[PDB]
């Protein structure tokens, strides 16, 4: 009944939002098990195992990242429930591939202000 | 003729725009280049991706849309060629480097001056 959760955020794209990712994961742990807590081959394979196990995939999509985009594309194809979180105050324009993938139900993209992330997650998960 | 889908950063940044033009110009010699509001962009691109025979991505500039295209392409069972420049100083995403299997999903490091010769070798 408590969901398994998969979190996505930029790493090699840049760690600008690392503190925010820690806040997101701390809040997700209140609701479920966060599965995400060659060398790169092991990372890919283990992440893909967890992605298929996840009940919800949550991605912070403000910092551009190949790996986050790839995770989202694989997740869509696995028909996962997906929540993407984007901060327009960053001054970026979110990728059309992510904004345009939203169908408002199984794949949602929410624009938000950084201070409100915990409350937003509360509204989505309760 | 073989149908080719090219991927490269746009909203991730257009730093490598000139290089993308060079790649696309060369790809036109080998096949149909399918990729010569946002919902329409996504839907049209996904239609073309589904119709592709080979997906070619320049993965040096980090980009959500390029990563998403590559994830969808894997699930659509497409042949994939990724091109990365170490001269950028970046460490390429583990999700892209680690998705490679050396045959149907290949990731090549390259130097900008050699991109035309690399593509000639890949497309014979
Ligand atoms: O070391 C890593 N570990 C990892 O899980 N990822 C996954 O890939 C996304 C980041 O991708 P990226 O920004 O690095 O390209 C994250 O959401 C992670 O789940 C990537 C890297 C190093 O690449
Ligand atoms: O306006 C657009 N048109 C488009 O085709 N893409 C596709 O998505 C990738 C770039 O993604 P991105 O850098 O913007 O996130 C490219 O390979 C394109 O095929 C994206 C945008 C604007 O998003």
Curated annotation (Swiss-Prot), chain A:
It is found in: Cytoplasm; Nucleus. Belongs to the 2'-deoxynucleoside 5'-phosphate N-hydrolase 1 family. The modification Phosphoserine is found at residues 10, 65, 90, 95, 105. It catalyses: 5-hydroxymethyl-dUMP + H2O = 5-hydroxymethyluracil + 2-deoxy-D-ribose 5-phosphate. Monomer and homodimer. This is 5-hydroxymethyl-dUMP N-hydrolase. It comes from the Eukaryota. Optimum pH is 6-7 at 37 degrees Celsius. Part of a nucleotide salvage pathway that eliminates epigenetically modified 5-hydroxymethyl-dCMP (hmdCMP) in a two-step process entailing deamination to cytotoxic 5-hydroxymethyl-dUMP (hmdUMP), followed by its hydrolysis into 5-hydroxymethyluracil (hmU) and 2-deoxy-D-ribose 5-phosphate (deoxyribosephosphate). Catalyzes the second step in that pathway, the hydrolysis of the N-glycosidic bond in hmdUMP, degrading this cytotoxic nucleotide to avoid its genomic integration. Its EC number is 3.2.2.-. Inhibited by AMP and GMP. Expressed at low levels in brain, colon, lung, peripheral blood leukocytes, placenta, small intestine, and thymus. Expressed at high levels in heart, kidney, liver, skeletal muscle and spleen. Overexpressed in a significant proportion of breast cancers. Keywords: Acetylation, Cytoplasm, Glycosidase, Hydrolase, Nucleotide metabolism, Nucleus, Phosphoprotein. GO terms for biological process: allantoin metabolic process; deoxyribonucleoside monophosphate catabolic process; dGMP catabolic process; epithelial cell differentiation; nucleoside salvage; positive regulation of cell growth; purine nucleotide catabolic process. GO terms for cellular component: cytoplasm; cytosol; extracellular exosome; nucleus. Induction: Expression is induced by ETV1. 5-hydroxymethyl-dUMP binds at residues 9, 11-13, 65, 67, 71, 95. GO terms for molecular function: 5-hydroxymethyl-dUMP N-hydrolase activity; identical protein binding; protein homodimerization activity. Its main location: cytoplasm. The chain holds residues 20 to 159 of 174 of the full protein.
